[PDB]
Amino acid sequence: PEEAIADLSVNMYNRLRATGEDENILFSPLSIALAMGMMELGAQGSTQKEIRHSMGYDGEEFSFLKEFSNMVTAESQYVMKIANSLFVQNGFHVNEEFLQMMKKYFNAAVNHVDFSQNVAVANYINKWVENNTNNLVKDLVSPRDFDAATYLALINAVYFKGNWKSQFRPENTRTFSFTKDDESEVQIPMMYQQGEFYYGEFSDGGIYQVLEIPYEGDEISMMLVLSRQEVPLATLEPLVKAQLVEEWANSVKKQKVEVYLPRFTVEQEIDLKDVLKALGITEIFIKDANLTGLSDNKEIFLSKAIHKSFLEVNEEGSEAAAAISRMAVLYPQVIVDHPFFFLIRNRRTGTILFMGRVMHPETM
Numbered sequence: 001p002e003e004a005i006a007d008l009s010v011n012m013y014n015r016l017r018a019t020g021e022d023e024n025i026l027f028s029p030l031s032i033a034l035a036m037g038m039m040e041l042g043a044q045g046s047t048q049k050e051i052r053h054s055m056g057y058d059g060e061e062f063s064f065l066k067e068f069s070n071m072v073t074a075e076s077q078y079v080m081k082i083a084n085s086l087f088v089q090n091g092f093h094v095n096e097e098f099l100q101m102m103k104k105y106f107n108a109a110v111n112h113v114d115f116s117q118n119v120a121v122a123n124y125i126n127k128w129v130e131n132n133t134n135n136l137v138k139d140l141v142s143p144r145d146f147d148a149a150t151y152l153a154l155i156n157a158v159y160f161k162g163n164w165k166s167q168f169r170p171e172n173t174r175t176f177s178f179t180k181d182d183e184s185e186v187q188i189p190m191m192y193q194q195g196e197f198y199y200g201e202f203s204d205g206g207i208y209q210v211l212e213i214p215y216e217g218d219e220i221s222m223m224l225v226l227s228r229q230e231v232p233l234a235t236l237e238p239l240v241k242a243q244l245v246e247e248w249a250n251s252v253k254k255q256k257v258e259v260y261l262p263r264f265t266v267e268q269e270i271d272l273k274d275v276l277k278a279l280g281i282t283e284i285f286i287k288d289a290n291l292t293g294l295s296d297n298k299e300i301f302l303s304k305a306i307h308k309s310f311l312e313v314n315e316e317g318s319e320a321a322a323a324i325s326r327m328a329v330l331y332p333q334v335i336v337d338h339p340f341f342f343l344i345r346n347r348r349t350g351t352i353l354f355m356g357r358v359m360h361p362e363t364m
Contacts, residue, residue, distance in 0.1 A: 001064075001349070001350075002346075002349055002350050002351040002352075003350070004055065004056035004057075005029055005030070005033055005056075005350075005351050005352050006242045006245060006246065006350065006352065007242050008029050008032075008033065008055060008279070009027075009029035009343070009352040009355045010240055010241055010242050010245065010355075011278070011279055012027060012029060012032070012275050012278075012279065012355070013025070013240055013355050014237075014240065015274075015275055015278040015279075016270065016275065017234075017237055019274065022181070022182070022359060023268075023359055023360075024266050024267075024268055024356065024357065024358055024359045024360055025268055025355075025356045025357045025359070026266045026267065026268035026309040026310075026311055026354060026355075026356035027268065027270065027307060027309050027354065027355060027356065028082075028158040028160075028307075028309050028353055028354050029352045029353075029354075029355060030068050030072070030158075030351060030352065030353050030354075031082055031084070031156055031157075031158040031307070031309070032156060032272070032307060033055065033065065033068065034065055034068060034069055034082070034084050034106050034108070034156075035084055035154055035156040035272070035305075035307075036051055036055055036276075036281070037061075037062065037065045037105070037106055038084065038086055038102060038106055038108055038154070039051055039154070039284055039291075039302070040052065040055075041098060041101050041102060041105075041106075041293060041294070042086075042098060042291045042293040042294030042295075043283075043284060043289075043290060043291055043293055044290050044291075044292050044293050045290055046283060046290055047283040047284055047289055047290040047291065048290070048293070050280065050281060050282065050283050050284075051281060051284070053280065054276075054279045054280040054281050055279075062105045062106075063105070065105055065106060066105045066106070067349075068351065069082065069084075069106055069107055069108075070107070072219075072220075072346065072351070072353070075217070076163075076216075077162065077163035077215065077216035077217060077318075078160075078161075078162035078163055078215050078216065078217060078219075078220055079159070079160065079161050079162070080158070080159075080160055080353075081132065081133040081134060081136060081137070081158065081159035081160070082132075082157075082158050083128070083129045083131075083132035083133055083137070083155065083156070083157045083158075084106060084108040084109075084155070084156055085108055085109045085110070085111060085128065085132075085154075085155045085156075086102075086108070086109075086110050086111070086152060086153070086154055086155075086294075087110075087111050087112075087113050087121070087125060087152055087153045087154075087155065088110065088111070088112060088113075088151070088152035088153075088294075088295070088300070089112075089113065089114065089115050089150070089151050089152060090112055090113070090114050091297070092151065092152070092295050092297040092299070092300050093295050093296060093297060094110055094294050094295045095293065095294055095295055095296065098293055098294045098295070111124075111128065113125075115146045115147060115148060115149060115150040115151070115153075116147070116148040118143045118144070118145075118146040118147050118148075119143040121143075121146050122141050122142055122143040122145060122146055123143075125140065125141050125153075125155060126138065126139060126140055126141060128155075129155060129157050132157075133157055133158075133159045133310075134159075136159040136310060137157040137158070137159050137308055137310050140155060140157055140269070140306055140308055141155070141304070141306055145304050145306070146304070149303055150303040150304060151299075151300050151301060151302075151303050152300060152301075152302060152303060153302075153303055153304035153305070153306075154272060154302060154304065154305040154306070155304075155305075155306055156272065156305070156306065156307045156308075157306075157307065157308045157309070157310075158307075158308075158309045158310065158354075159309075159310045159311075159312075160309075160310070160311050160312070160344070160353065160354065161311070161312040161313075161314075162215040162216070162220060162222070162344075163215055163216040163316055163317050163318065164213065164214075164215060164216065164315070164316065164317030164318070165213070165214040165215055165216050165217075165218070165317060165318060165320065166193060166195040166196070166317060166318065166319075166320035167193075167315060167316060167317025167318055167319065167320075168191040168192060168193045168261070168314075168315040168317065169193065169315065170191075170315045172191070172192040172193060173189050173190065173191050173192065173263060173315060174189075174190050174192070175187050175188070175189065175190065176188055176189075176190035176260070176262065176337050177337070178262065178337050178338060178361055179337065179338050180338070180339060180359065180360060181232045181233060181234065181338070181339050181359070186360070186361070186362050188262040188263065188264065188361055188362070189262060189263035190260050190261070190262050190263070190337065191259075191260070191261045191262065191263050191314070191315050192258075192259065192260050192261070193258075193259055194256065194257070194258045194259070194322075194331065195256065195257070195259070195320055195322065196254055196255065196256050196257070196320070196322070197211055197212060197213055197214070197254070197255070197257050197259065198211075198212035198214075198221075198252035198253065198254050198255075199211055199212070199252055199253060199254075199255055199257045199332060199334070200248070200251055200252040200253055202247075202248070202251070204235070204236070204239065205239070206227070206228060206231065206235075207228070208225060208226060208227040208228065208231075208236050209224075209225075209226050209227075209334055210223065210224070210225050210226075210248045210251075210252055211223070211224045211226070211252075211257065211259065211334045211336075212224075212248075212249075212252050213259070213261070214347070215317075216317060216318050218347065219346055219347065219348060220344065220345070220346055220347070220353065221344070221345055221347050222313075222342055222343070222344045222345075223248065223249070223342060223343050223344070223345060224261075224334075224336060224340050224341070224342045225248075225340060225341040225342065226334065226336055226338070226340045226341075227340075229338070232339075233338075233339040233340060233341060233357060233359075236341060237341065237357075240341065245343070246350075249345070249347075249350075255332075256322070256331060257331060257332050257333070257334055258331050258332065258333045258334065259334050259336075260333070260334065260335040260336055260337065261313070261336050262313075262336060262337070262361050263313065263314045263315065264313050264358060264361035264363070265310070265311065265312045265313065265361075265363060266309075266310075266311045266313075266356055266358055266361075267308070267309065267310040267311070268308070268309055268356065269306065269307065269308035269309075270306075270307050270308075271305065271306060271307075272305030272306055272307045273285060273302075273305050276305065284301065284302045285301060285302050285303075286301060287301055288301075289301035289302065309354060309356075311344075311354055311356070339357060339358055339359050340357065340358055341356075341357050342354075342355075342356060342357070342358070343355045343356070
């Protein structure tokens, strides 16, 4: 099932590593899976067979895609904000039924603009996004993204901030230096607690740690992957493959671990196209794309695709309660004070919500 969402994230990750040396990396393979759903709803024949293949082959699917945008978005703890939308030029008429489907399954939204007024559309689209991220995701696009061209444009942004299951007490939050992989250090707030998590060490092709902090509700969790003090994260990254991810979750063991987690925020905005292309998604991007599913107009293809994810982490959470020798106990430490790989996952369904890497945890 989401087995597939597994692969998709991993691929997108590896591509972005290659075309992204040394910057922070965040994206919701969930969100992006919905975006492509829309496209698939609009595509037919040659183009549709291409989005079906590159994503999840067997339909089916939307059901699935209806689950996510809802069963992981519609409670008191862990906030998901998703703005999925397609923006199409004024002369082009989107088929009466495509608009029904788009709302029936994805609950997204189609808009009409005049890309020739490239500033006004750019101001309109930033606003719209804010209007659907409770004003948390700003500055998605600029006037130069648009011109009389463009015809239509995919916009896809996500905010997420969850509630820790065992909450860090802010009285243990202290200022730590965070050494970046270029050995420059910035100071951060370092949350800390001793509690029970899923933990575990693994080795390379040296041993790195994997620490899976659950959110309130047990449905979701964030999984960190942190290497040894001298070792650049780029060392471990190549290892990220579907199999290893699922291995980590087959393998980590619940147990009482000392955690040092910085209070931080990660936000990354990619252009959705290179990455899609890299995954074999190319036809929706060319003149003779086949989107006769969304409109009768000859003529229409995809021109802009922008993702932006935003993830916030801090102390907030619930209250939790809490032997080798009976005369002594040994606790592992996880001091997350240098760059890490992490992903956010549905521990039950195994859907990935975010994959990324903190390279510069700074704020301001």
